[PDB]
Paper text:
Human D-2-[name] is a member of the 2-hydroxy acid dehydrogenase subfamily of the VAO/PCMH flavoprotein family. Regardless of their promiscuous metabolic origins, D-2-HG and L-2-HG can be converted back to 2-OG by two [name] enzymes in humans, namely D-2-HG and L-2-HG dehydrogenases (D-2-[name] and L-2-[name]). Like other members of the VAO/PCMH flavoprotein family, D-2-[name] is comprised of two major domains named the FAD-binding domain and the substrate-binding domain supplemented with a small C-terminal domain.
In the apo structure, the substrate-binding site is occupied by several water molecules; in the D-2-HG-bound structure, there are a Zn2+ and a D-2-HG bound at the substrate-binding site. The structural comparison shows that the binding of Zn2+ and D-2-HG does not induce notable conformational changes at the substrate-binding site as well except for Glu475 which adopts a different side-chain conformation to interact with the Zn2+. The lactate moiety of D-2-HG is positioned in parallel to the isoalloxazine ring of FAD and the acetate moiety is extended into the deep end of the substrate-binding pocket; both moieties are recognized by several conserved residues. Specifically, the C1-carboxyl of D-2-HG forms several hydrophilic interactions with the side chains of Arg386, Thr390, His434, and His441, two hydrogen bonds with the O4 atom of FAD and a water molecule (Wat1), and a coordination bond with the Zn2+. The C2-hydroxyl of D-2-HG forms hydrogen bonds with the side chains of His441, Glu475, and His476, and a coordination bond with the Zn2+. The C5-carboxyl of D-2-HG forms a salt bridge with the side chain of Lys401 and four hydrogen bonds with the side chains of Thr390, Tyr432, and Asn443, and a water molecule (Wat2). In particular, the O4 atom of the isoalloxazine ring is involved in the coordination of Zn2+ and forms two hydrogen bonds with the C1-carboxyl of D-2-HG and a water molecule (Wat1), and the O2 atom forms three hydrogen bonds with the main-chain amine of Gly209, the side chain of Glu475, and a water molecule (Wat3).
Numbering used by the authors:
A (entry chain B): 53 to 519
B (entry chain A): 54 to 519
Write the structure that this text describes.
């Protein structure tokens, strides 16, 4: 397995130092450390003996100062919803939680610029800005637990990426505490600013290996006057692809989401979450969201789109909603697939960028390659962005199934010049499969960046660069 | 200010470059005159060698040689940059991307364009528009600027309000590092979270961390309907309320919101012989929309104009959808900087400020300089909080400079603003970044420069503080 690097260990003197630095924010009880030591998938468990819960940036600076002097490894943690083992310790790394860094600093009701602490929960920020007629530029099924700082650190994609784009575009600024405790102020709450290198970009998607994000400045789109959702059954993946093409051609700028899922996804959400399907049974389903300023115009656009889709046989059955309750019910069928999967058994999870025309090939292939050894195989996800969520469920983990899946899936993906981690990132699980998507020289430059910014390697060791 | 201890180009270096780039070694002093002078004609180098590589490998071998020989290199694109970054200070070798102008691929479904860094922006716009796509950025310099220079400077421009930053729209880069190492981050994927987003370091790095040789970029679909409204507003309060109403009533179809004052209109009319299409007003607003249903857009515009004219925010306005008149109206805005450079010496500031006080500095400067300036103008990308502030004089005055600087930068800092929103830093602004950046940021910038280019051969005297 992996070998523990020669870090120090937490002493009683370290515990007293942390008690000084963050009064009331030191958790040492072994039973309390159980939950923060286990990842969301429940397949990785750390042995951390101390949880720190600072409230302020200065406390994070001082914690890291101490850990730097003492050579203590630190595991940053947000909502602990990450999918790649990046969020929990491997050995006895200190868990530094942002749970209590949950304050909004300011919100400007004209520019739409939000500034908040890294540990603000995404759904709560959404409620906050929606009260002021804005929205968050990203959303995901983990919204109820994930922290904005986690989202920035993982460069989270999500359900409205197609409309508002990457955090690399929507993050306006960051405050980041470096491994030695230096507070890096890149908190430029300005729409535009070309005064030197865009240092904050290094910390977007770096998963806590280059520094700990403590404050975020983010551009919030205006809240749309009109939101529509359509949920459609398609008789094959070719019709899904043509439905996408037609959807872009007829809805255009009002399109805010395009998600697909297969029949098995629908069956699992129905069986485990008791969610009835609102359309006729089909081998594929598509959820489309639109967001716009004029309800009448959006309705005309959608009506004509539906007319054409049903006319040319791209869609066999479809339903539409504007009522918030019904919209949420329809969205639940897509958002909760991952939960139903984790309720179905042990989950093998792959998050791939592929040519959209070939997005589903791997699922049919794996259904053939695997047999009754797979309990289920599913494909779903962000088709508009070329992003497939591939999942295999089984009664239990088995080495034989892992050996059938890997490296086969990663070589198929490399054969398509795809990404073996479209959005979930690298972390612990994928640290040794980056060669399928990144050339050696890039990986080396990444290693040099790590050495420059964290020469002691105390920030999230065993991740997210190759060994 | 003072020349760093770089080597000097010998006859053997010339013979090596002739081996590396046959046909691409320019040493004629008269041919070297134009590439040594920046667009503003206020900086002029003494470079004696211009290199014009064709391929990425030629660039790699050139930089390998310069690394072994400790020769400074000045990358140059279209040479339209505004901050003295694009021309040597002394005798840096000018490496031009002029011949690196081929498109490599374009995926007719994803809209992803892969092209060499020296492709001119206008030409790329033509290419992708022939295929029903558009570039995610546009600039007044479109006719000359290179996509490599746009990425190196993180160019903003006239459709930034709709499509946003190159940090979002650039999908991949091939970069040649100072020692010749070719860094391949030339992915063509919409989403790829397999490690650090290294390409981001080179977007806005102004050639100090590496030479961009290949760009992969996401082109938005070409709009079915483009509309432009050119409106006259009786004051800046009404400009700001017009902006708010525009966002409320046009929404997602909005693709541009630009403003200019009366003096800008007078200067473009005088020097460029472009007549105003609207009544004389203290302020003018150019609104562009882009949409998929021309009728819905036209209806939105109708209701917007009716409301704006009815509530007194706009006094008189003209709209255009014909491509020719659209380009005429856009020309009234795009060529202001040229009319200014024909009015005499130009003091140029590019500031990010709170939109609600975007114009306050123009009024302040007009009171502060009164008759010692020829003109003070404010215009630009109001939707993005970005003011272009220009002062013209019949000739340069150290007096007027002392009146403008540091005052303007201090004012900006007082607004927690940016002293260079878009155009960047280059040579001109290397020592005024402290008004927008704290010392720890600038130090980390210097550490990255030292990691990527320890000899400092790439673009010396830029773009970090002295
Ligand atoms: C139901 C569900 C749906 C999801 N949907 C999506 C989706 O649509 N798109 C998508 O991209 N992902 C999705 N995810 C996974 C996604 O990575 C997480 O939901 C989220 O982005 C991470 O937030 P977090 O606070 O839980 O981070 P954590 O899991 O706590 O940590 C993530 C990583 O970043 C580091 N980190 C955390 N906080 C900080 C910080 N403040 N500073 C520095 N480093 C830090 C951690 O060390 C770790 O390596 C989903 C997950 C679930 C469970
Ligand atoms: C009329 C006019 C209008 C303009 N409008 C705008 C506007 O709306 N928005 C805006 O942001 N800017 C605008 N600009 C200025 C803008 O910075 C440049 O026009 C544009 O960004 C491209 O510059 P360029 O291709 O000429 O690069 P150059 O001027 O040749 O170079 C600019 C800088 O980038 C570096 N560089 C160039 N090519 C490369 C390369 N391949 N690799 C690495 N480094 C490189 C150079 O060393 C230099 O430091 C305008 C300029 C003019 C003259
Ligand atoms: O669990 C998964 O594979 C996908 C989860 C998440 O990224 C989603 O978009 O639903
Ligand atoms: O020269 C200027 O002040 C601004 C130039 C350019 O960014 C423009 O938008 O006109
Ligand atoms: Zn996802
Ligand atoms: Zn500009």
């Amino acid at each position: 397995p992996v070998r523990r690097l020669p870090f120090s260990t937490v002493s009683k003197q370290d515990l007293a130092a942390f008690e000084r630095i963050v009064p009331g924010g030191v958790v040492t009880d072994p039973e309390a450390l159980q939950a923060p030591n286990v990842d969301w998938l429940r397949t990785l468990r750390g042995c951390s003996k101390v949880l720190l819960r600072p409230r302020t940036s200065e406390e994070v600076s001082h914690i890291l100062r101490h850990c730097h002097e003492r050579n203590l490894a630190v595991n940053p943690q947000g909502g602990n919803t990450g999918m790649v083992g990046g969020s929990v310790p491997v050995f006895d790394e200190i868990i530094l939680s942002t749970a209590r860094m949950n304050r909004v600093l300011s919100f400007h009701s004209v520019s739409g610029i939000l500034v908040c602490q890294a540990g603000c929960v995404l759904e709560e920020l959404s409620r906050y800005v929606e009260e002021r007629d804005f929205i968050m530029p990203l959303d995901l099924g983990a919204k109820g637990s994930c922290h904005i700082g986690g989202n920035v650190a993982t460069n989270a994609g999500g359900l409205r990426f197609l409309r508002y784009g990457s955090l690399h575009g929507t993050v306006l600024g960051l405050e980041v505490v470096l491994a030695d405790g230096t507070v890096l102020d890149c908190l430029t709450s300005l729409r535009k600013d070309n005064t030197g290198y865009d240092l904050k970009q290094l910390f977007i998607g770096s998963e806590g290996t280059l520094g700990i994000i403590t404050t975020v400045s983010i551009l919030c789109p205006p809240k749309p006057r009109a939101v529509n959702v359509a949920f459609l059954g398609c008789p094959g993946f070719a019709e899904v692809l043509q439905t996408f093409s037609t959807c872009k051609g007829m809805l255009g700028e009002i399109l805010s989401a395009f998600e697909f899922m297969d029949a098995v996804c629908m069956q699992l959400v129905g069986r485990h979450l008791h969610l009835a399907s609102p359309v006729q049974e089909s081998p594929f389903y598509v959820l489309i969201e639109t967001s716009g300023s004029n309800a009448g115009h959006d309705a005309e656009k959608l009506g004509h789109f539906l007319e054409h889709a049903l006319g040319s046989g791209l869609v066999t059955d479809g339903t539409m909603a504007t009522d918030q309750r019904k919209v949420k019910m329809l969205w639940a069928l897509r958002e909760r697939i991952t939960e139903a999967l984790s309720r179905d058994g042990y989950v093998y999870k792959y998050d791939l960028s592929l040519p959209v025309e070939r997005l589903y090939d791997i699922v049919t292939d794996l259904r053939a390659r695997l047999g009754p050894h797979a309990k289920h195989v599913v494909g779903y996800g962000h088709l508009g962005d070329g992003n497939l969520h591939l999942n295999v469920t089984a009664e239990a983990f088995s080495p034989s199934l892992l050996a059938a899946l890997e490296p086969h899936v990663y070589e198929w993906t490399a054969g398509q010049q795809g990404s073996v981690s479209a959005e979930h990132g690298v972390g612990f699980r994928k640290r040794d499969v980056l060669g399928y998507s990144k050339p050696p020289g890039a990986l080396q430059l990444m290693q040099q960046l790590k050495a420059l910014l964290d020469p002691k390697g105390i920030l999230n060791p065993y991740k997210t660069l190759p060994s």
